[PDB]
Amino acid sequence: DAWEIPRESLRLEVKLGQGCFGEVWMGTWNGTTRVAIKTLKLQEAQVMKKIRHEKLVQLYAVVSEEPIYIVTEYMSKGSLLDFLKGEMGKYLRLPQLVDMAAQIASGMAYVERMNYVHRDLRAANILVGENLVCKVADFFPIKWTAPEAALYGRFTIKSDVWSFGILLTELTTKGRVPYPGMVNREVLDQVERGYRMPCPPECPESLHDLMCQCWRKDPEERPTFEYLQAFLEDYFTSTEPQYQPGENL
Ligand SMILES: CC(C)n1nc(-c2ccc(NC(=O)Nc3cccc(C(F)(F)F)c3)cc2)c2c(N)ncnc21
Numbered sequence: 388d389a390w391e392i393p394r395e396s397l398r399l400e401v402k403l404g405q406g407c408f409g410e411v412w413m414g415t416w417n418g419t420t421r422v423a424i425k426t427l428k429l430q431e432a433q434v435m436k437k438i439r440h441e442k443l444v445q446l447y448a449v450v451s452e453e454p455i456y457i458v459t460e461y462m463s464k465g466s467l468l469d470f471l472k473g474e475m476g477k478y479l480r481l482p483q484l485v486d487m488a489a490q491i492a493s494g495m496a497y498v499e500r501m502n503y504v505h506r507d508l509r510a511a512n513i514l515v516g517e518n519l520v521c522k523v524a525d526f527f528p529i530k531w532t533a534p535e536a537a538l539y540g541r542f543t544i545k546s547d548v549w550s551f552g553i554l555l556t557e558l559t560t561k562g563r564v565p566y567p568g569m570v571n572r573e574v575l576d577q578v579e580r581g582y583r584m585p586c587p588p589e590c591p592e593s594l595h596d597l598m599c600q601c602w603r604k605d606p607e608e609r610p611t612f613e614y615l616q617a618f619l620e621d622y623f624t625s626t627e628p629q630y631q632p633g634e635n636l
Pocket residue numbers: 403404405411423424425431434435438443444459460461462463465466514523524525526
């Protein structure tokens with residue numbers, strides 16, 4: 388396969404993250420190319436190679452023979468989650484946050500067009516680069532999972548939409564865990580009983596509406612990412628043209 392490079396062309400410099408199955412390292416490829424490298428202790432490619440969009444983290448190369456390595460572009464800001472609760476958090480406002488959201492929706496829209504599913508969409512799985520560039524990446528997270536998928540394993544792009552809705556709460560709360568003061572169990576019970584998170588403080592009701600649309604009980608009622616992208620891209624003109632900066636949003 389033409390993605391295959393030789394291990395030798397990889398210099399694993401700094402370390403970046405630790406996981407259940409392996410690490411992630413800052414690295415150098417062919418001496419001149421800065422890269423991120425995920426490690427193990429090759430099916431995570433069947434579809435990662437076919438994927439190509441400016442808002443999805445780009446694969447660069449693989450090394451199949453164990454230990455399987457993986458080279459992707461480098462995101463200089465780490466996960467959206469760490470970014471949100473980091474020092475940058477306090478400076479981020481609605482416009483910056485709606486723009487990141489839009490970008491993510493854009494990528495998910497591409498996934499949508501390709502008839503793919505993500506299954507685990509959430510801030511932790513979003514990577515940030517220079518100039519607030521956000522890219523979808525790396526595909527139990529019950530609090531992020533649509534009911535039909537959690538209960539009956541009905542995973543679809545529509546359940547991905549659900550997660551997007553939950554992801555919007557992360558952006559608007561600067562990275563707080565959703566359903567505060569609730570454990571996974573009572574989340575299931577409540578959500579199935581129609582409970583939903585309320586409009587976050589300083590968040591415009593129009594944006595909470597969008598969330599609620601994403602959390603509709605019937606997967607088919609949920610908007611497409613194509614709608615979501617367009618909605619957010621246009622947000623401050625067609626939806627909230629009277630937006631005034633607040634203390635946090
Ligand atoms: C936060 C730290 C652990 N980290 N992690 C990465 C990173 C490296 C590899 C991956 N792998 C990955 O995204 N695999 C994958 C598998 C299936 C589908 C996809 C998708 F197309 F959706 F992006 C992606 C994810 C994050 C990464 C990076 N590129 N640049 C800077 N820091 C990084």
